[PDB]
């Protein structure tokens, strides 16, 4: 396992990675210093000898140049320390170990390498500064952020071995993935948050700004589209210039809820050939969903055009967002005066309700639900009552947050954050929990030495009444800490166990492939499936279409 199934290897590199609004999807920013260290053996041929000679000339510093040379006999001429580094006359059939250059194909990697999309061939772009750069939208298959993560890079040595990367491993041709028969890359974070911003019915753009956005898309035909608004002023709707990014013959229809084709709420989505007709663009469209823009554009126009599509959308939305701006204060976690008073009295009517049930169960008038201990029912009820209290006060708060509320808008776009986030920050953090139950009695018959014994009250067993905004108290803090720790402990432990399951899985299905009779087998030729997946298809090329023979009145089926 240490020296055979896996071996330390030459032509490799590692560094801190960072994001780049301006690299193209399939690119990889390579620091110059690394480009100058990694080599490719390139053979001297009539087509390259001019550039190749120049490279040797430029020596091994700085890019772009070359380290060494390989003669007929197979000796190793070194550009660093050689009395002939200046005048070497390249023979056809010689090897020139040159630097890694722009548009070289390199295997890019982040560990742990769980699925195939963790090793994707990128196109090299040598850049300044010491970090590998990638496009945010390649973030996800890598599970990579920029809080310190490092990534590896391997450089192919032979002509075929590069073929193998660019034809099999290239980032565009991984966009739609056999894993979940969907796209595994989408529009994230800023771009995502802003693309919704950009496409509200209130979002209009005047001429100056439109022409930049227009010029920002490389594939722009250079035809100013007619402004949605003309008299008496040309305002161009957000939806309009974003459409410039989307190709032709790209049809898309999405009815999301109250969508009724007037979209009184700009719901759903409708893109009649490369122009969007109605609806705010957010996660369900331009995310890595199933019946969304990326899935369509890949299948319809190809990976290349789709990979190109990532850049274009980011280039516009980012520009538009850069001059619109977006932020988040603590003002975004303040709920109304009224809403606060309601939230409090809400929390109380559940504290008063647990009180009763407790008082009741103490008088022996509580009846155990079939198949459970008397105490079990009591816990179950109180936990439900307090959970309900939270969700109720959360929703209470969420309704009072305006549309200009920043936390809401990220949740709206689908950028980051959810109901509970809003809930706990502004209304009530809720009930703490270890091993599935509320906070135990560590000391005898009580939970902390500041309580009297036998205290099953909500505060005493770990109900944080307060919100993060308002501030946890001593006991609250301590309990919240108790729960929090469990998280860490089994996060730590989930990473351990998962990493084993995987290794085992993989080693067990390792030699299973589809042979040239569509028959899935193994090293022994044992049939596992007679037709791969019972239908012979590859999972990338597969989408969720409704079989509409299945439903409806026999009557309407006839009609």
């Amino acid at each position: 396992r240490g020296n055979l199934m896996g071996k330390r290897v030459d032509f490799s590199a590692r560094t801190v990675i960072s994001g780049d609004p301006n690299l193209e999807l399939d690119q990889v920013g390579v620091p110059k210093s690394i480009a100058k260290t990694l080599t490719y053996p390139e053979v001297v041929t009539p087509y390259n000898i001019d550039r190749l000679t120049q490279l040797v000339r430029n020596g091994p510093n700085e890019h772009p140049g070359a380290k060494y040379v390989i003669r007929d006999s197979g000796d190793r001429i070194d550009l660093r320390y050689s009395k002939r580094a200046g005048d070497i006359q390249l023979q056809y059939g010689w090897k020139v170990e040159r630097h890694i250059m722009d548009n070289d194909p390199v295997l890019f990697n982040r560990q742990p390498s769980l699925h195939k999309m963790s090793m994707m061939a990128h196109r090299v772009k040598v850049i300044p500064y010491s970090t590998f750069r990638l496009n945010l939208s390649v973030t996800s298959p890598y599970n990579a952020d920029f809080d310190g993560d490092e990534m590896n890079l391997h450089v192919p040595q032979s002509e075929e071995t590069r073929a193998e990367l660019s034809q099999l491993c290239a980032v565009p041709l991984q966009i739609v993935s056999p894993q979940s028969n969907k796209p595994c890359m989408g529009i994230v974070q800023d771009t995502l948050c802003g693309i919704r911003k950009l496409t509200l019915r209130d979002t209009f753009i005047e001429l100056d700004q439109v022409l930049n956005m227009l010029y920002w898309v490389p594939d722009w035909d250079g035809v100013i589209p007619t402004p949605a608004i003309i008299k008496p002023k040309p305002l161009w709707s957000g939806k309009q210039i974003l459409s410039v990014a989307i190709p032709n013959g790209i049809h898309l229809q999405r009815f999301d809820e109250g969508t009724t084709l007037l979209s009184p709420k700009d719901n759903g989505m409708l893109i009649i050939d490369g122009q969007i007709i109605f609806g705010v663009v957010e996660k369900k469209t331009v995310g890595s969903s199933n019946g969304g823009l990326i899935h369509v554009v890949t299948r319809e126009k190809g990976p290349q055009v789709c990979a190109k599509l990532f850049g274009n959308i980011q280039k516009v939305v980012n520009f538009w967002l850069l001059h619109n701006g977006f932020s988040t204060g603590i003002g975004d976690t303040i709920a109304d005066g009224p809403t606060m008073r309601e939230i409090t009295e809400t929390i109380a009517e559940a504290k008063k309700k647990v009180l009763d049930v407790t008082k009741e169960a103490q008088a022996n008038l509580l009846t155990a639900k079939h198949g459970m201990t008397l105490r079990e029912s009591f816990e179950d009820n109180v936990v439900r009552f307090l959970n309900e209290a939270r969700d109720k006060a959360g929703r209470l708060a969420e309704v009072n947050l305006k549309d200009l509320n920043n936390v809401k808008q990220m949740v709206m776009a689908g950028s980051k954050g959810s109901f509970i986030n809003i809930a706990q920050m502004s209304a009530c953090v809720g009930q703490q929990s270890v091993e599935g139950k509320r906070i135990a009695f560590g000391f005898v018959d009580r939970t902390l030495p500041h309580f009297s014994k036998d205290d099953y009250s909500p505060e005493s067993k770990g109900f944080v009444e307060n919100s993060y905004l308002r501030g946890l108290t001593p006991q609250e803090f301590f309990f919240h800490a108790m729960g929090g720790r469990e998280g860490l402990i089994d996060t730590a432990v989930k990473t351990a166990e998962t990493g084993y399951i995987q290794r085992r899985l993989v080693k067990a299905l390792e030699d299973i492939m589809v042979h040239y009779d569509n028959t899935t087998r193994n090293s022994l030729g044992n049939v596992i499936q007679f037709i791969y997946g019972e239908d012979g298809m590859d999972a990338a090329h597969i989408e969720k279409q409704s079989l509409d023979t299945i439903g409806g009145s026999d009557a309407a089926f006839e009609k």
């Binding site: 193998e164 028969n181 899985l505 067990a508 030699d511 090293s523 596992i528 439903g551 409806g552 026999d554």
Partner: protein, 159 residues
Amino acid sequence: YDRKVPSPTGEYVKEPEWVLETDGVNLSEVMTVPGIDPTRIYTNSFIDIMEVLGIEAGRAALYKEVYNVIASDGSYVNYRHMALLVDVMTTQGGLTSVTRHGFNRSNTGALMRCSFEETVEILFEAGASAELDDCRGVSENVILGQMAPIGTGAFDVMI
């Protein structure tokens, strides 16, 4: 439980039934019980389904189970994968675990099995039994440093 079923008139409808949920398992005997539909009874214990209703019913159950782990988590993996997993545990005849007790006995290449779990004891009684290695396993060619019969290495090129 709520249940979708065909109307007399064709459309599907919500016609909610009563369902009994159990702590514990004796499938052998609760299905023979009078009063219940013995055609739809179920355990989360695919290990019993395999025993009572047969290997193929088990395969279908083992998948149903694996599936439910993913989907409960929100997720959604395509059916061909989990199927391959299931089917692989299943083709031996019964439930073959994904451990050294399961798949790592199955008379495949000696070098292949030695690359997982029992590393030397495999290599040893492979020497005693004087085994022969096809060398068509992936991991054997990894060791030998030859191009493995995988994808681009699944065929031959000539003139």
